[PDB]
């Protein structure tokens, strides 16, 4: 015990002598290979997702570089990690949500969608023939009774609802920032401030992406550059 | 895929089935379990391992399973594996009864299960079941019977036998004290307590720590009873009384 | 070693050793030559005899009236592939009442042979083909490989010591398009003869010829029927 | 379903899983068969003795049909499977041809079963050999043997199991017209052959008369009658 | 089409080490406690609650299976969720055939049997969880545990997860068979306090109860009240 | 590595080396480029001639996958051809189910998910190819997507794949492609291919050119012979 | 009609801490009597019986298939099946064959194995259950049986009066049905004993 | 450890090369093709006098006009022989004619390489067949002998030996073989050569011989007919 290994416990999802799944732990490291960080926060009126938009090239069509995804018209999502894995998990989420609506006659609750994706991830932690997906999904939406929601699930199949949360390279630093801020008794401002602190950047409007849902306007919306700029300008004048 | 495959159902270089042998080591460590054939009945006597703690005592026994009206069994080895096999025994017994409208002869039930166990050692690449079983019963072909099966899918009929902890030592004791053609349920019960008193190295043997079931005939009908704790204490006492005359 | 047994394991150099090893099967087969003119496609092949009393191995197989093949590598894989090709040609005549175009047949071989290069426990086909055909686009010589790749050729040679044939074919290929048929076969035979040890010669026992074109359904020539092509005899 | 090749060739042409199955046979109880003139006999070593065992439940000699039976050496569980499959097949033959099987027919069936398990994905070979005996419709007595490879042959007499080497050496020198002229001697030839390595279960099949098993009082008659003769021979 | 071969096999000493290693995941899991009272059953567990950022009410560890049966675990949460879904599905299948709620013992047998499958079936690992299952049927309370091997046991009281050996000796010198449910809740919470670290609130433990009225979770405000006196 | 034998195994640093090794097969391939402009997309490929016995045209690396979509490939050619068949089937089925030409973005995403599925399992290996998809229509404009062996898919103004990738990208970055036309860009695609071609290390190549734009009425087509030759001549003379 | 091919009749009836179940004894094929001791009531428990009328082959098959299921249930559970639970088990077995049914319409009579409360029910051939507090009938003379039961049945009958009523209901019913009768068997089920009688009955 | 369909660096399938090594452990068999018929002769290789020599069959009738001699792992040969039998009867059923020797050989040889472990239908073949075969028969091409090995390569042969002593036996066959050779000369030649290469002293019970002739159906020689030919020694 303490970093012990037997057999194939570093290669497939079997228990190590301590009771660990090294392959799952390695899927968490795969999340940081993308090099990006994402933050999400929930208020009484709205929920917001902000993530980095790195476009080093500019031979890229930057409209197609995004980690923000519409799942349904009322459910939005930010993906952190391996891109192709992420895209696949987005398809599955879309499929699960459409199917729920078809069978049950009402939009999937965000908590249920997250749970479902987590339960699917769980299968890859217990069956030896496939790897976990090296990605993390954060979902936002409005619930009719509970208000705005942010949910996250991970490659271990854990999931939770959050007041605010983060994913990727600066997760632990964003968590600390949000902890000290939430400890006291504006949601888009907090999210972009958190991200800008932990990266020490101070953004241009083309270097982030922002997604929102609000109690008034529950349709998932992606902000334009101009709309983001207006928030960046409003913060700059303290 | 080839890389990860244990290869559970292949021969070793000396013609051996390693997974079977290792299962048999698991059984060697499990709670001791014996059966004794008498003229007027059959018994099973087993060490309890669910013994005790803050445990609740909810079922009629821990390791004695009724299989049908005329048959019971006991198990030594992996408990969950035993639950799969005993459940399957019950099913085999009811399939026979459906088809013939008479009870499955004891040996046929054992054989049917042993074919399943054998198959797990020859195809499929799975681990075998880590279980040995003692079976007691009555049928109209051979009357009172006792059988033993093990993880290879091998079996045999016995007048007395033991599986589990200190088996070799128990079979010694039985070879000497067991009277072929001349045992009663009362003398076999005394012999059972004698052997369990030797083989449980957990020194001063107790009723809380053993289970006995008897199988007899009464009015053309098979009776299967798990002795209550008052009967088990009373028999331990008669074995403690009996040790002296020996002095 | 940990990268050379499975067709599903990429090496660190971006190679698949099982495919390369399948390609060695074809380098070890006896040589064959494929070439074409404006009007004909011809195959020429060296046949090996396991002993003096054995018959020489077939290297040239009929596929349809307008297609034949020459093989190098595992014979059993050659037969399985040739049977596949035959079937696709029959299907096409069944459905459309016209010959399957040669480039479409070659595509079908590519798809079919690529499949096992990507699945665990499967293996490449260990055979390389030269394919002679004639259709509306005229004569063709294609080459197929164990990698599932294929090539459209002015001429080609595969198998043992085929590099010598290739070198002859390059030297004279600017002549091929306007050769009459005898000239073209003479060219094939000379290219094939270059693969032979200095002592060894082309005989009626060891040469097999395949011809298709504008005037002629795919026809195979063995034994006494190759004699007209061998005399002939330019060399020295 | 388990598609692993289990029996494969090794570099010098060996099928090692089959050779290992053969090692399982060599650690089994010795079994002997002799083809007499108008009788056929099979006998087999101890098992364990063990005073507490029900003798009936561990016989290593088994009826396949009225006119064919077998003994085996090797893995007993594997043998039970082969035995039941052959029994099923005897009844199919009876069904579709309205004759009992020849001893050869069923020997051939058992052998091809065994051969299949050496050339099929997910299965190890059967760890047994079998001696198969009986009589055809025309009265000719028969002794056949099968092994894990699916090879089969006819024998005048033979052994399999532990110490088959020496027991076969004994039979080679001792099988003569004189030792099989009568039934008593044929039966004795088997018991002497076993006493060479060996208790002893034994059974006989007379032309038409179906399978008789002996009988521990009738057996130790022959035991003492050979044991005292191998003391005079010292 | 899967890996068909087992991933749990016997070692030379007769151990199934993938199960032993599953048990190690259980032993490093958060603590759980079950106590069978005379007139009820209590299940309690520690919520490993890092960060004030979690919404504590969003996911639960103590779960209803039916109106009369509930669950808690120690070990890996996502594995537990699988088993909660199967137990629920098993409970309904039973109800559809028999039109009677599934007896606690029957539910445990069926769930244990699913756990057994994952010790033998191709290409999978066992579950890294032990379950505690409470229920009320035949006018009487039940408490069961089911382990990664698929073995189950009926308990009067027990503990699992981190520090369980001590939890069990604590309960041993504290449980009696004639104890009421409100008192058993108190001692369950005390058993967790033995191995807590951090100071308890009603937002980082979870408690479920089972009696004649059925199974339910205690609310934050009910737990807060029991936490006065602790 | 430990660790690099199966796409179902993560390394301890969170990498999937079988996918990286497939990427290496592409990075050993000769270079293909795509450029999106004002009124279409143009593709060019450096096609190495491994033998003068091959026909001028053989081993095409530019494919029509629908009447409005071209595909440009680098890497293991049999894997690339099989991917062109998947793309073709996807576009064909799209038209059958929904009744119109598949939007390029949607075809790229669908084919990328297929490529992605070969990166999770021991049962299969990753594709050893990267490919670009190009189209033009009046409604959607010019679009150029690129997909690699991990199954990642992005839209581009300009793109290069294969061994002189980086060298090609720096030349492409010098173009104001947004304001230029296909008839102009062909010359520049040919020019860039001749620049990044290592004429010492691997002599002799054929240039392969195709386009899709207003000037082809939204059909993907080979660049005509006379225009290819003028672009070759421009490229060659710009080098000297 | 498929249900009149073999004929037959069963009924059950509730009393004070007791139940009764009865059946005719004829096995016949259309007009022909084959046997006069054919069993239609099967014990499912010490105090719990199922009577089946309908096509004789399915009477037997349903009884045997049900017993299979009950035997497993009792082995696996702690215990003897409750009446209401046997009803559900039968319902379930019949509705599995919803689109190719067994041609049998059972009645169940018993006492709870703990509380000894009386229980009766019947089911149709696809497993619709009907529980009543008085009586249930099934067979080719259902109308005849309803006439008798509806006129004779009273509440809270002791074992003796229950016997006379169920017997008179059956005997007079089947005597107006050509393909039921050739004898009647009656089981009275009490807490402490089972009483089984055959009745003196018309044999035409 | 590696799968049954792995290529070696030299471009051969390991399992097939290894199956070819198993043929070298088999008894020697000889075939000779003459204008008067073909003959097949095989060393039985008796391992004990207790064994019935006639229960060793290594030459088998395929159809009336075709025999088969085998060497290697004999049990493996059964499924191949059955398949040859069934194919010739299927051909007769459909076309009302006899199947050519070359066609029968071809059909059997198409089973060689049909083994594997993930494509895989039943529990279909897990490995190649450890057998070589000589098919000798008569069709309208005249008398004909073909050889097949575990690779699925098959070829016509004027004379051929297989099994342990085949190098030596083949060398002796090159020496004696001529095209105008009679069948009775070919029979004597093959017995002469088996005598040399066998570890046991040749006699009428430890070899088998069969012919197929234009006039005549497949014929296994009797003890008595063997004794006649053995006299010349
Ligand atoms: K996995
Ligand atoms: Mg009537
Ligand atoms: Mg009448």
Curated annotation (Swiss-Prot), chain C:
Q: Which domain of life is it from?
A: Eukaryota
Q: Which family does it belong to?
A: Belongs to the peptidase T1A family.
- The signal peptide, as residue positions, is none
- Phosphoserine, modified sites: 107, 174
Q: Which residue positions carry a glycan here?
A: 107
Q: Name one GO biological process term.
A: immune system process
Native species of this protein? Homo sapiens (Human)
What do we know about how this protein assembles, alone or with others?
The 26S proteasome consists of a 20S proteasome core and two 19S regulatory subunits. The 20S proteasome core is a barrel-shaped complex made of 28 subunits that are arranged in four stacked rings. The two outer rings are each formed by seven alpha subunits, and the two inner rings are formed by seven beta subunits. The proteolytic activity is exerted by three beta-subunits PSMB5, PSMB6 and PSMB7. Interacts with NOTCH3. Interacts with ZFAND1.
Record keywords, A-Z: Acetylation, Cytoplasm, Glycoprotein, Immunity, Isopeptide bond, Nucleus, Phosphoprotein, Proteasome, Ubl conjugation
- Fetch the InterPro entries from UniProt: Ntn_hydrolases_N, Proteasome_alpha, Proteasome_alpha-type, Proteasome_alpha1, Proteasome_asu_N, Proteasome_sua/b
What induces it, per record? Answer: Induced in breast cancer tissue (at protein level). Up-regulated in liver tumor tissues.
GO CC list: centrosome; cytoplasm; cytosol; extracellular exosome; nucleoplasm; nucleus; proteasome complex; proteasome core complex
As annotated, the Glycyl lysine isopeptide (Lys-Gly) (interchain with G-Cter in ubiquitin) covalent link is placed at 112, 205
Q: Extract the Gene3D superfamilies matched here.
A: Glutamine Phosphoribosylpyrophosphate, subunit 1, domain 1
Q: Which PANTHER family match?
A: PROTEASOME SUBUNIT ALPHA/BETA (PTHR11599)
- Where is the protein localized? Cytoplasm; Nucleus
**Per its record, what are the GO molecular function terms?**
lipopolysaccharide binding
For this protein's source organism, the top of the classification is: Eukaryota, Metazoa, Chordata, Craniata, Vertebrata
Keyword Transmembrane belongs to the record: no
Q: By what name is this protein known? A: Proteasome subunit alpha type-1
From Swiss-Prot, chain D:
Q: Name one GO biological process term.
A: proteasome-mediated ubiquitin-dependent protein catabolic process
Q: What positions are modified (Phosphotyrosine)?
A: 152
Indicate yes or no for the key word Protein transport. Answer: no
State the superkingdom: Eukaryota
Q: Which residues are glycosylated?
A: 129
Extract the GO molecular function terms from the UniProt entry. Answer: identical protein binding
Q: Tell me which UniProt keywords the record has, alphabetically.
A: Acetylation, Cytoplasm, Glycoprotein, Host-virus interaction, Nucleus, Phosphoprotein, Proteasome
Q: What induces it?
A: Down-regulated by the ribozyme Rz3'X. Up-regulated in colorectal cancer tissues.
- Which residues are recorded as modified (N6-acetyllysine)? 221
Query: Which InterPro entries does this chain map to?
Result: Ntn_hydrolases_N, Proteasome_alpha, Proteasome_alpha-type, Proteasome_asu_N, Proteasome_sua/b
Cell location: Cytoplasm; Nucleus
A GO CC term attached to the entry: nucleus
Q: How is it modified after translation?
A: Phosphorylation by ABL1 or ABL2 leads to an inhibition of proteasomal activity and cell cycle transition blocks.
Free-text function comment from the UniProt entry? Component of the 20S core proteasome complex involved in the proteolytic degradation of most intracellular proteins. This complex plays numerous essential roles within the cell by associating with different regulatory particles. Associated with two 19S regulatory particles, forms the 26S proteasome and thus participates in the ATP-dependent degradation of ubiquitinated proteins.
Family note:
Belongs to the peptidase T1A family.
Mind telling me which NCBIfam families this protein's record contains? PRK03996.1
- Name the UniProt record assigns to this protein: Proteasome subunit alpha type-7
**Organism annotation:** Homo sapiens (Human)
Q: Which gene encodes it?
A: PSMA7
UniProtKB/Swiss-Prot annotation, chain E:
What are the BP-aspect GO terms? proteasome-mediated ubiquitin-dependent protein catabolic process; response to virus
Assembly, in brief, is: The 26S proteasome consists of a 20S proteasome core and two 19S regulatory subunits. The 20S proteasome core is a barrel-shaped complex made of 28 subunits that are arranged in four stacked rings. The two outer rings are each formed by seven alpha subunits, and the two inner rings are formed by seven beta subunits. The proteolytic activity is exerted by three beta-subunits PSMB5, PSMB6 and PSMB7.
**Lineage, opening ranks:** Eukaryota, Metazoa, Chordata, Craniata, Vertebrata
- Cross-referenced Pfam families: Proteasome, Proteasome_A_N
* Predominant location: cytoplasm
PTM per Swiss-Prot/TrEMBL: Phosphorylated on tyrosine residues; which may be important for nuclear import.
Q: What PANTHER family does the record tag this protein with?
A: PROTEASOME SUBUNIT ALPHA/BETA
Q: Which residues carry this modification: Phosphoserine?
A: 4, 11, 13
- Where's it found, cell-wise? Cytoplasm; Nucleus
**What factors induce this protein?**
Down-regulated by antioxidants BO-653 and probucol. Down-regulated in response to enterovirus 71 (EV71) infection (at protein level).
> Per its record, how is this protein called by name?
Proteasome subunit alpha type-2
Q: What does this protein do?
A: Component of the 20S core proteasome complex involved in the proteolytic degradation of most intracellular proteins. This complex plays numerous essential roles within the cell by associating with different regulatory particles. Associated with two 19S regulatory particles, forms the 26S proteasome and thus participates in the ATP-dependent degradation of ubiquitinated proteins.
Swiss-Prot record, chain F:
**UniProt gene name:** PSMA3
- Residue numbers bearing the N6-acetyllysine modification: 52, 201, 225
Q: Which UniProt keywords apply?
A: Acetylation, Cytoplasm, Host-virus interaction, Nucleus, Phosphoprotein, Proteasome
Looking up SMART domains in the UniProt record yields: Proteasome_A_N
Task: Briefly state the protein's biological role.
Answer: Component of the 20S core proteasome complex involved in the proteolytic degradation of most intracellular proteins. This complex plays numerous essential roles within the cell by associating with different regulatory particles. Associated with two 19S regulatory particles, forms the 26S proteasome and thus participates in the ATP-dependent degradation of ubiquitinated proteins.
Recorded family membership: Belongs to the peptidase T1A family.
Which InterPro entries has this protein been placed in? Answer: Ntn_hydrolases_N, Proteasome_alpha, Proteasome_alpha-type, Proteasome_asu_N, Proteasome_sua/b
Q: Tell where it localizes.
A: Cytoplasm; Nucleus
UniProt-listed GO biological process terms: proteasome-mediated ubiquitin-dependent protein catabolic process
What name goes with this protein? Proteasome subunit alpha type-3
Pfam families given for it? Answer: Proteasome, Proteasome_A_N
As one GO molecular function, the record gives: ubiquitin protein ligase binding
Q: Which domain of life is it from?
A: Eukaryota
Q: What induces it?
A: Down-regulated by antioxidants BO-653 and probucol. Up-regulated by bacterial lipopolysaccharides (LPS) and TNF.
Phosphoserine sites (modified residues): 238
The record's PROSITE patterns line, in alphabetical order, gives: PROTEASOME_ALPHA_1 (PS00388), PROTEASOME_ALPHA_2 (PS51475)
This entry carries the following GO cellular component terms, namely: cytoplasm; cytosol; extracellular exosome; nucleoplasm; nucleus; proteasome complex; proteasome core complex; proteasome core complex, alpha-subunit complex
